[PDB]
């Protein structure tokens, strides 16, 4: 089970980086890894995908360049990368 409320808790530490770039805070990487750790079924991953896209669309300040580079900023074994071009219906 994942709810958008879970997604918001995890990504909270990342929001200012997602708008302005710069140094990714350690707490942001903790949320990215924690969200991945908790998204273990196809439905839960698609739910998280949809929550994240809703958030990205909610403020014009969010940058595609920064959402895209975030998983590789934080680790080498993060399997998912969600941006505005992601079709959440296709996410496995």
């Amino acid at each position: 089970m994942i709810k958008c409320s879970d997604v918001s808790n995890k990504i909270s530490a990342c929001l200012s980086y997602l708008k302005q770039g710069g140094e990714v805070p350690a707490d942001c990487c903790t949320g990215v890894k924690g969200l991945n750790d908790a998204a273990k079924t196809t439905p839960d991953r698609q739910t998280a995908c949809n929550c994240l896209k809703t958030t990205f669309k909610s403020n014009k300040d969010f940058k595609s360049d920064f959402a895209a580079s975030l998983p590789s900023k934080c680790g080498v074994n993060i399997p998912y990368k969600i941006s505005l071009e992601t079709d959440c219906n296709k996410v496995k």
Side-chain angles (χ1 to χ4, degrees), residues 13-18 20-32 66-67 69-75:
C14 299
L15 297 179
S16 292
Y17 168 82
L18 289 169
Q20 296 292 126
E23 168 174 346
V24 179
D27 287 3
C28 172
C29 292
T30 295
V32 169
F66 297 154
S69 65
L70 187 45
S72 77
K73 274 283 224 178
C74 292

Side-chain angles (χ1 to χ4, degrees), residues 32-89:
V32 169
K33 294 180 174 302
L35 189 51
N36 173 51
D37 286 344
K40 292 129 53 65
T41 69
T42 294
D44 279 355
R45 299 163 172 162
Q46 295 190 345
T47 299
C49 184
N50 279 317
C51 302
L52 287 166
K53 288 187 65 182
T54 296
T55 298
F56 298 161
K57 296 186 208 116
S58 71
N59 195 303
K60 70 177 184 299
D61 279 4
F62 288 118
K63 309 291 193 280
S64 62
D65 285 7
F66 297 154
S69 65
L70 187 45
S72 77
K73 274 283 224 178
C74 292
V76 304
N77 290 310
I78 306 171
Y80 292 101
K81 175 173 67 162
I82 306 306
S83 75
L84 279 312
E85 31 192 6
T86 306
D87 184 340
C88 299
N89 297 294

